[PDB]
């Protein structure tokens, strides 16, 4: 029932020391604003997805600027073919295309 | 090498839905550091994680063939988060036209709200270890393909998965909503150091709807 002292100790035991190392270790970006404005109605679909979208895309531009500075290849090449999470037949059928 | 090393035990109880099974499969593809094991008291998950040498557990608990809970822990000393998962939509589904590399390392986007209270700050760190992909794990792939986002709306954690286009975004799935139920000191044991007073079980909710 909100033992803040123990959750504080749990965080310190368990967190990795990210400041002593490079952004590539974690690739995580925390937003500055609460993503709580951008939503006038918690129960409107298109409103909250837009906020989610915004928070994520802001995190991606930040992440690309940092991985560029670190010389870590970023964008998936159009001609790099590795196993994807969905098949190409699945993608083509979802778009109603001829395979 | 790198400082961030993670191996996550990915395991479920008996009784998971078809929809539940799909999410497990989605996370297994999205997390090359996960190790999917045969199905599973809950203290016995510390031994199983030591068998497969995992320092995290993602345990999906299904009840009544419809309610899905996620238990996230650090075996064998803890802590443990218990979440109630709702609004589940797997990457299977019609309106998700994003695709990404199986095993590429995602960007993680966190709401500023995660820095707002001690229980959110502990969850944030734990989600990074589990839903981030460690550099440069066995079965991981190069290039940055997609983002997994976490946002706090009506004190629930809303999770989305987006493919990075070129730069715009297109949703992959899966998609779901977690609400924190409790936090245990230990790993499926020890005292509760957090309880959500706003959480109510879906079995009570289903009953109060019958009562009309």
Author numbering:
A (entry chain A): 195 to 293
B (entry chain D): 26 to 65, 70 to 195, 210 to 255
The authors write:
Brx1 is a Brix domain protein that interacts with Ebp2. We determined the crystal structure of Brx1 (residues 26–255) in complex with Ebp2 (residues 195–293) at 2.3 Å resolution with de novo phasing. Brx1 adopts an α/β fold with pseudo 2-fold symmetry, similar to other Brix domain proteins. The structural core of Brx1 is composed of two curved β-sheets that form a half-open β-barrel sandwiching two α-helices (α1 and α3). The surface of the N-terminal sheet holds helix α2, whereas the surface of the C-terminal sheet makes an intermolecular interaction with helix α2′ of Ebp2. In addition, the Ebp2 sequences that flank helix α2′ wrap around the Brx1 structure, forming an extensive interface. In the cryo-EM map, the Brx1-Ebp2 complex perfectly fits into a density bound to domain I. Brx1 interacts with a flat surface formed by H13 and H21. The position of Brx1 would clash with H68 and H88 in domains IV and V in the fully assembled 60S. Thus, the Brx1-Ebp2 complex must be released from the current position for ribosome assembly to proceed.
